[model samples]
Target: VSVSEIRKAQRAEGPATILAIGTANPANCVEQSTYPDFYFKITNSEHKTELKEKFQRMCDKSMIKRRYMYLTEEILKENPNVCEYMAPSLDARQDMVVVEVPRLGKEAAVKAIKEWGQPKSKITHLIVCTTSGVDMPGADYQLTKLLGLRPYVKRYMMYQQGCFAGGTVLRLAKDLAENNKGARVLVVCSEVTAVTFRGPSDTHLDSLVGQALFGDGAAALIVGSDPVPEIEKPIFEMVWTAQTIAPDSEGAIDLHLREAGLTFHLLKDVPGIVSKNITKALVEAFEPLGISDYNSIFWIAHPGGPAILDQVEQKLALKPEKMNATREVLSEYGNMSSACVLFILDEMRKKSTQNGLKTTGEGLEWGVLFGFGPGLTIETVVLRSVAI
Candidate 1:
């Protein structure tokens, strides 16, 4: 084949677009007001009066009204070891996640597939992301089986990529859709707090921040380019994608597997570190598109917490309304790890439609979605909103 023909065959005519979105959370809902009491009660940590008080203080300002979790009072009671801090509970935790992760992911993926209005057989690719579990076949394989996707469907699994896994998976979906003709990629991000739940430690107050903010949920999306006339509709066009790591920022945020279970720490300085670099990442991402005014674009930012959102708003000089979708997600679901950004994206579209906006991006033609996580990693994706 000629070089030009080969080049033409190598790329799709249009950019990859998010076709549909779906999200799900565990049924075990806990109100933030009662969470500290409930958490302490279940873990048998009520004796730690000082730690309980400190945890309650963190929950009060979390900006989260409620959250859903896979673990409940009943589950904890049955698995006492898993509730105790520093207990050798990795085996039990991993066993639970090995089953729940894919199950919850399927719940979200089913909704996405339904919204896409395409048969399962039409899905050409699957990308599953999570920090919740590690298994031999991976969530990708189990999810494929659960979803009943075709045998030949190409699959990619991302494990322990942290909160940025949403952006990471979407970024990969863009390449898959744009480079392959008629490709349809299904992306799923599922997280379960069960593996990471443990009694609060007086010495490790940072864990309280995580316990206060983290929640279990999943988000799924269908992405494709050159939509079939009436069969597929584009939601947000994936215009451009980029990633950057801040210098000298190791250990700012970290997650690890230990004998006790999954352990994570969030440095108090992380919000500051991320804010310091937010503007630079945004400029580099949008400058090539000739877009400069930050306020003109919609924002879909991961709700790492109130502080991080506040820092992003202040640093970018963004309007309070610009971050509303993200904040609302935080309030409703807490930080669902990699699933949070897509939750924001889904919320933005629903709100836009309810208000009868011209586009899904709250009436804006352009926007940027950000995911900040471990390594102080920043994921940026420039998005173009298509008219409804």
Candidate 2:
């Protein structure tokens, strides 16, 4: 009889919901139009005028208006090993990530907690995800101290989880929230380019693509179940989640940690592979809801780049407006790895409210947020919008 009572009191009653969201970026912002010049100059690569011109073209086509970076010119100059493409710079890079990762995360998490309208002591769990920092007593533990969360708050650190980490963590947070009574899970995703920043090299052209594509940002959210109506209101309900990997795509999007630093390898075929499988994945995820009209629902896509977004649009036959939130995040922030999707979610909510929409999800009652990364994995979360 006592065991039954404890079991009933331990679990929550409702699905996990998003109680609040917060996003932050570094202070330095570089316009995409001038990034080629800034990047080439910072790396002292202006001597290669031909390569600089080529990089300029790539920037023009990236559809990214600007990006925020943690690595400023001074920082690069001081760390020559980081500015040199082949230099062994892992030690110096770690020093920067170890500090900036948690610091930046605290900024975003504080915003989220403030919006959540609760004391820090109420948070029962903390999840910190990042590809920019990796060390024992990692971002998870550091963030707990930085945020001044309860010492006993359960912690989870996800390192090198890549772009899909936002979805990955949300999925885990949902489980934690629904499984534990009164659980308020704080989920933070922060990324910095310091770990991957390097000088351009003619021999390794793929690295050039990476340099042109990525940026830095952080996002945080509060997840909980059974919100007390008097004080807590949910923005979006986590209805369902799914993770699937594409066939024969072991190395489509790969991140390797070497003696130098973190190296990224993104195969050109990645966009096509992801877009081709999107329909199947969505069908599987939405099948439970008996939903088939893809265009009717809002989309919170990760905005990996112009290619993935554009291809998915074409494949799904979605209207241009369906991708506005994703495109805006990409245009303004570039690919902030795992943090990109939550930024898009925050954008969608803001736009919906500004336009006086009935629901938080672009006037739609249902939506899908998806992210893809290593393992050629696609993480999909089905969301239900709630009135403001």
Candidate 3:
């Protein structure tokens, strides 16, 4: 879809507002360097010094440069010693999901919505997105009950959609609100990728890259028709959303439930495929916008991993700092699956506020938010500043 077409389509007879946004991380967060220290302590048999050396060597050839927060030491050191049972896979999985993925994820979501402070009466829909674990009465159901949302509030649950799920949810929410004028939509995202860690014996080196870059996080947003008097409007008025699935790319990335836990099947060629198809998707999605140059537009691309980011930068010939926001979030919070994009958007919002960029005209800041997922799928939206 072109930019002009999207703008035309999103032009409501009245206004649509983004009521509030909230994001939360687990209480226990770790630095990237702490992984080596964690590895040593858990093994118990190896000295810290020896483990450090081995870790350095393993990291040198691995795809991950830095990944933070493996698990809380207290949780790892708990009874039954789940950490002890899972630690041996460090060389293989290169990452792990915390022992209590579902609990932590749900907790974060609850915390975020509470912070948003939306009135229960105003919320008409609840949307939950995740790809980290196996759970029923899933996040959508659990969050609705815990937050005491309206009894008849409609619920939408998106599972196993991987990293793109976050961006996908926002676009879906926007569409729903547009079609059902006066609707209030709440979107909650949570993912605990650490639970899917595999040991060295089970997977190849390339697939391990995902483990190196992912982390756990949850976030919430309130998109509605009600306008808050003082709050600044959203950056891009939600315009058009498009999702494309590449043929035969299913094996490129896969997530499955296993007796042991969740397993990730990430192919090394994912970056290459992304680079090859990104331009086509961008052109197709942006053709209606009359945008001739990417330099003139803002890009909110997903940080799938360092390699994926690099591939996108090279493919689009983006400026050096084009993805600085994405990189910073990934470095600090890891991928967090669908929550990652929300984190980046949150950062962008903060930056815009600090610099007073929101007052600028639409042409000064055209945004293209995009994310990738398992079908080797791509989801994108074209947004521009709404006229005040």
Candidate 4:
């Protein structure tokens, strides 16, 4: 059944679980403080100084210490002065996206497959999602080649879904797994947001925020129907899902084209808008499953930025230490778009195992996973941690 179909049907035939996940980062780890100058220098030199200062301040407040990128470090070393700097054209950026996105996706995919100890030939469906760039032979095609999957493997690609994409794709993975008995799906999220990187124009606070916020990364998940023995390992079952677009919030976050490249427009009200409407989506998602109270739910939320997480913490009445893993990812990897959700899920699973969840069975903890993106969208998944 389709997701819409699942919406109407009370009990679906297959209850798919997230079996394993792996995430990948780029070659260069760019310190957050070091990025502003790089982001600033790529702009028109006439207005560079003023923009550079604002950009620096933006980075300082970002709460992100480092971000991994496919960004060239040669410029920092080679250009002692900012005059020698040059920003790539849209085509050049797209080329890099093609190379880096697929490469990163492959790394994550390979690791997930290895960890699952599953043969490449066993994967029946391949689903790939990305928002940064598009090309004739895209991340999906390249990932298939690099992963050495059979030519007959079915493929579906999602684009322009932004940070909320992983949640959407996870739901799709579940649909694929449940609809097709014993079907094994490989869901890869490859977002090279750095490709959308541009020098801060005087007008775009969104670009400044986007530049300071996003990094490059990929995450691959193996979601299948194979039952794992209760004594062996941890598994996160996809119990419920929710997707909603905040009404009239299109003005909140915008990524559009300009004379040079994509210009991001972020309204100041975003954090608040996300805070107000996010729980509405969660409530709707939970309503379908008869879940009223949320305090006890173990949560894994996307770390879009510090403010975004803070807004969620306040709205949900969560503890200061509750979102530590989310904070940890932001401080270290920055906002890695959709892949960050998997990164958080990966870390939280470690915590669950340490707390002895691997041997726990029925009444496994109710967990919620949240992802926010463009359209001021809310994508949520209710995770049931089965002891088996």
Q: Which candidate would rank higher by lDDT, 2 or 4?
A: 2
Q: On residues 1-388, what C-alpha lDDT tens digit does candidate 1 reach at each position?
A: 5998987887777899999999999998989999998989888889999999999899999999999999988889999888887799999999999899999999999999999998989999999999987998889999989999998999998998898778888899999999988889999999999888988789998877888999999999999999987778888999899888887688889888988888888664877888999989888988887888899999988888899889988988888899999999999999999999999999999999999999999999999999989988999998999797
Question: Could you tell me the lDDT of residue 47 within candidate 3?
Answer: 47
Ranking by TM-score: 2, 1, 4, 3
Q: How does model 4 score by TM-score?
A: 0.86
**Each candidate: what lDDT?**
0.90, 0.91, 0.64, 0.74
- Candidate 3: tens digits of C-alpha lDDT, residues 1-388: 5987776665434334455567767666655565655555554534445435655455443334454354555545542233332333332222243224434545655555565565667678888877755456666776777777788888898876788787689888886677554577788777765556433322254434544567777777777654554542444456677888876576888866544455667663777888888888778867887776876776677777777888889888888676766777877777778888877877766665666664322235567778887888888877665433
Better by TM-score, candidate 4 or 2: 2
For model 1, the local distance difference test gives: 0.90
Candidate 3: list runs displaced more than 4 Å: 1-17, 40-70, 78-118, 226-235, 358-363, 386-388
| Worst ten in a row by lDDT for model 3 | 90-99
Q: On residues 8-124, what C-alpha lDDT tens digit does candidate 2 reach at each position?
A: 999999999999999999999989999899889888899999888888988998899989999998898899889888789999999999999999999999999999999989999
By TM-score, how accurate is candidate 3? 0.81
- Candidate 3, position 216, lDDT: 72
| Poorest stretch of ten by lDDT in candidate 4 | 77-86
C-alpha TM-score for every candidate? 0.97, 0.98, 0.81, 0.86
Q: For model 3, give the RMSD to the true fold.
A: 6.3
Candidate 2, pairs of clashing residues: none
The candidate that achieves the highest lDDT relative to the unseen native structure: 2
Q: Report the alpha-carbon TM-score of model 2 versus the true structure.
A: 0.98
